[PDB]
Amino acid sequence: LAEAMVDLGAIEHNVRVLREHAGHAQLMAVVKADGYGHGATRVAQTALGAGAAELGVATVDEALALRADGITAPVLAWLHPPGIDFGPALLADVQVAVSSLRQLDELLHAVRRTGRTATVTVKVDTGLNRNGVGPAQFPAMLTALRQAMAEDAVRLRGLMSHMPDDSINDVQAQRFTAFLAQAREQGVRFEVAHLSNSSATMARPDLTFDLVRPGIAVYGLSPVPALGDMGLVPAMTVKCAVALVKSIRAGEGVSYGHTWIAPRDTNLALLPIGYADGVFRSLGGRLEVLINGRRCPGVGRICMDQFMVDLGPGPLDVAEGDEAILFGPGIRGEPTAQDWADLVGTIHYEVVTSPRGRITRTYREA
Amino acid sequence: LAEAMVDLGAIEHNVRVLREHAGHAQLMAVVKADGYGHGATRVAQTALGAGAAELGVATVDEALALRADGITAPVLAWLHPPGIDFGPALLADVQVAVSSLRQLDELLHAVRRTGRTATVTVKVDTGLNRNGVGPAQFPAMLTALRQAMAEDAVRLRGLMSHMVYADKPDDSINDVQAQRFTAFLAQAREQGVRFEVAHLSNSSATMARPDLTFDLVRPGIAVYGLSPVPALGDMGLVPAMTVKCAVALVKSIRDTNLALLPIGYADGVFRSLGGRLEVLINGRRCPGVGRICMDQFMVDLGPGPLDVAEGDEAILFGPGIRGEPTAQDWADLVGTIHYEVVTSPRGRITRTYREA
Ligand SMILES: *Cc1c(COP(=O)(O)O)cnc(C)c1O
Ligand SMILES: *Cc1c(COP(=O)(O)O)cnc(C)c1O
C-alpha cells in the first residue's frame, strides 16, 4: 500500500560520517521516539554494527524494548516520570541519567531494593532550563554521589548537558566546563562528559568532550539546514503506489470543498494515503510528488486517507501500480523531509516522526 | 504517562442522537482509520449496541481486522489498491464497493475461485471526482452486474456516493449531488437492475440535510462526538476523546512556575501549537511557553503558592465539560480540522476506554 522505507545502508553511512567528525570521542546514537520514526531496534543494530559505542534514549521504557529485542550494548535513559521505580532499569542494566536531587533519591531507593549498583549520569542545566541539576543544587548532589559511590551504590559514569556559532553555545559550553571543575574541585570523578548533539558534533567539533549524542544526523537529516546536507544521506523514503489514473476536464473541482478547479483538461493520480497516515493536511495544494522521474503537484485537499496529484496534460506516463515518492534523500530528484518542513512551517524531525496508519515501515539492508 | 481516553458512553449517546436524525434510514457507523483514532473495534461494538445497523471502513484490511476481533455485523469496504486479492474478503463475509469495471472483474474472478457470492455495492461519482464510476461508464457496469447477478455470482446490495462538502450543509452542491444520484438510480432502472439500498450521506448531511437522505446514512465524525458543522456548535453531540498526561516536573523561574509535560510532536502534539496552546491543570488554563519538543513541552503555572504537583493530571483536549480545550480549539490554532486532531495522538499517548 504505502511504505516508509528505511535504508540501513544510509544509516551505516551517516554513522561513519559522524564518527569521523567526532574524532576521538565515542558515539552515543540517539534512538528515542522509536528511532525518530525509523525503528529504534533496527537502527540501533545497524548503528552499533557500524561502530557506535552506546545508545541513548529518553525513557526507561524505550530502553527495555531495546533489551527485549536482544540489544546488549550500553543504553542510557534521561527523561523519567516522578515516582518511577528504577528497579527494572537496574536489573536490565540500563544506565540512568538524573536531573534532580529527588530523582537521585528515587534511584538510590531502587538500588536498595534491588541490590543493583546504578551506572549513573548527572544531567546538568547549562541555560537550557527545562530540567537538569542547577549550579545551586550541584554541590549537594556531589556530596550525595561521593557517599553513594563510597559504598558502591552507584558507578559515576557521566556528566551531560544539552545545547551553531551563536555565542549561546560558547556560554553553555563554559557553564558546562564549570560543572566539571566544581566536580573536579570537590574530588568527584566522572568517567565521561558529553554535551554534543548532532549540530554541535558536526559544526562545533571544538566543543566535543568524551562522547557525542547525535540523533537527527544518524537518520541523515541535516542538523543545520541552512548549511545543506552536510554530507549525510537521509535514510527514510516515504512512498506509495498509484491507486488510479483518470483524465478530467477543465472547470471540474477535485476533493472536499472543491478548493481546486482545473484550469484545463489534465490527468490526475489518486494516492491512497492521507492525514491519518501522517501526510500533514496543511500540505494540501502545496506538496509535490515524484512519479517516474517527474514532479506532480498535489491538487485539492488532503483527505483522511487519500489525496490527488496532477500529472499534467502531457503524454500519460503513469499507470496504476506505479510508485509515487512523497519524500526521500533527494537522489532521484524527489522532495526531502526538509521540503515538507518548509511547506508546513515545522522541522524535519517532526516530518519523519509523522508517518503511520497504512504507511508500513520497511528496511533495505546495508 | 499519557492517554487518549475514549468515553464509550459518549459514543453511545452520539449514535442515538444520529439515529434520531436518520429516522427510518439505517445507520452505517464509519470506523475507518482505526475508528478515527478512537479504536474501530471498541467503537463498532458500542455503536452496534446503540443501534447502528452496519459498519463502514475504507479498506478490506480494516474490515478483516473487525472480523478478526469477533465482529460479525455487516461491514462495507470501499477503497481498494490495484493488486488487491478479494478472496479473503469474500471468505470473511466482507462487502465490497467497486468503483470500476476492472474492480468488478477482479471481484468476479475472486468469486469463481472462492465459491462465495459477492455482496456488492457500486460507488458512483456525483461530484467528488475521486474514485467512483462516472455516468458514461455506469451502463457498462450495470450490464456486467446483471449478467453476474443472473448467474448468482453477486448479490446487488448497494449504490453509494460521497458528498463534496463535509461541513457546509446548505451549499447547493449538496442538492446537485443528490439529483445526480437519482439520475444514477434512473440509469439502473433502464438497465433492469435494482439495488437493495442507496446511500449518499455523511455526518453533515445526516444531521443538517435530512431532506437529502436516501436508504442509509454513513456518519463518521459525529459518532466520535465532533461537530460536523463546527459553526453551529456541538450539535447536541459529546466529543468522546480526552487526551491528557501527568505533570512530570515543576520548575521555578516575571517570577513564575512551569510544568513539564513529557509528550511532544512525536506523540502527536502538533509542533505549531507551541506558545499558542493552553492545558487545564487543577481547573485553570495554563499557556504553553517555548517550543514543543519531540517528547516534551512546558506550560506556565503562574507565580505564587503552588496548587499544582508532579503527578497531577493535565488535560490537553476533551469534550469541554471541565472547561478544558476542545479538539476544535486545537484545530483553530493549528489551521486544520478536528478530524486531523483526533487521528494525531500516538507514541506514548496510550488509548484507553471508559465503559458506557
Ligand atoms: C534528542 C536528544 C539528543 C539528539 O539531538 P539531535 O539534535 O537529534 O542530534 C541528544 N541528547 C538529548 C538529551 C536529547 O534529548
Ligand atoms: C470518511 C467517509 C465517511 C464519513 O464522513 P464524515 O464526514 O466523518 O461523517 C462516509 N462515507 C465515506 C465513503 C467516507 O469515506
Curated annotation (Swiss-Prot), chain A:
What domain of life does the UniProt record list for this protein's source? Bacteria
Listed A to Z, the keywords are:
Isomerase, Pyridoxal phosphate
Q: Which PROSITE patterns match?
A: ALANINE_RACEMASE
Give the record's pathway.
Amino-acid biosynthesis; D-alanine biosynthesis; D-alanine from L-alanine: step 1/1
Query: Catalytic center at which residues?
Result: 32 (proton acceptor), 256 (proton acceptor)
Cellular component GO terms, alphabetical: cytosol
| Enzyme Commission code(s) on record | 5.1.1.1
Q: How does it assemble?
A: Homodimer.
This chain's protein is named: Alanine racemase
